[PDB]
Design a protein around this ligand. Structure first.
Ligand SMILES: [Cu+2]
Ligand SMILES: [Cu+2]
Lengths: 150, 140
């Protein structure tokens, strides 16, 4: 997983090209005024933006994905995302939802919490578990990028 | 900053090549048998192995990997105010300050690795065997 900030003038060091181009593109936008909903960027890449409410961790399931990477960025507010960097125990995950490309699990092993501030972004590759929106209302966006583009 | 695990079948995904080659290399070793002290990998890369304020670097990135135990590391994803830092040590390539602005905690478990690029503030070893590979950013 990658954790970084669009605002850091060196955030592109190390980044896969496709991810660098989407971040360079997000830095062009009026992120504040972005409408809620789905926004297409490419044939391949879209993003969803929303104003959810942080909810207590035990109230929601972690997720992971098979086909897309996420680039999540926080726009307004502050948000916790529990994450695991070790490969999940798939035997413990719900059935794969193929239309929305995800599987759920009550919890993350070896989990730790990333605290997100405006313009911070996290990249979670496929099979990287994350439970975003953890503990109050925020604005955020997640970009969905096919991993085959890496 | 990157956070993964040497033992994840997918860890190379998106990884800069030089880092993938070092991780491959660590995977090649008995890490628990590793002698404490400085080992040189390449002509340009080496690592410190050890059994134990925030720091950042200019010319090197760190790959910090936990071998035994469990360690909390405080990190900042946001770019530091470079004024609140003590003067730059050139010999050892680091700058120190007491706290990281906008920081969070990464709990390392054996075989997890974390990559800190130049200017990513981190404060390792918070309440074990570990190593930290040193590699020049140029090679990225
Ligand atoms: Cu996701
Ligand atoms: Cu360091």
């Amino acid at each position: 997983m990658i954790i970084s900030s669009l605002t850091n003038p060196n955030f592109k060091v190390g980044l896969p090209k496709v991810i660098a181009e989407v971040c360079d593109y997000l830095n062009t936008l009026d992120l504040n005024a972005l409408e809620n909903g789905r926004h297409d960027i490419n044939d391949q890449i879209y993003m969803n933006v929303m104003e959810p409410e942080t909810a207590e961790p035990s109230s929601k399931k972690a997720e992971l994905h098979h086909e897309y990477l996420d680039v999540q960025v926080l726009i307004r507010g502050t948000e916790n995302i529990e994450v695991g960097a070790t490969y999940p125990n798939l035997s413990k995950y719900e059935d794969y939802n193929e239309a929305d490309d995800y599987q759920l699990c009550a919890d993350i092993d070896d989990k730790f919490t990333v605290t997100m501030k405006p313009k911070m972004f996290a990249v979670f590759y496929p099979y990287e578990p994350h439970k975003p929106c953890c503990v109050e209302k925020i604005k955020k966006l997640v970009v969905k990028v096919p991993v085959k583009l890496i």
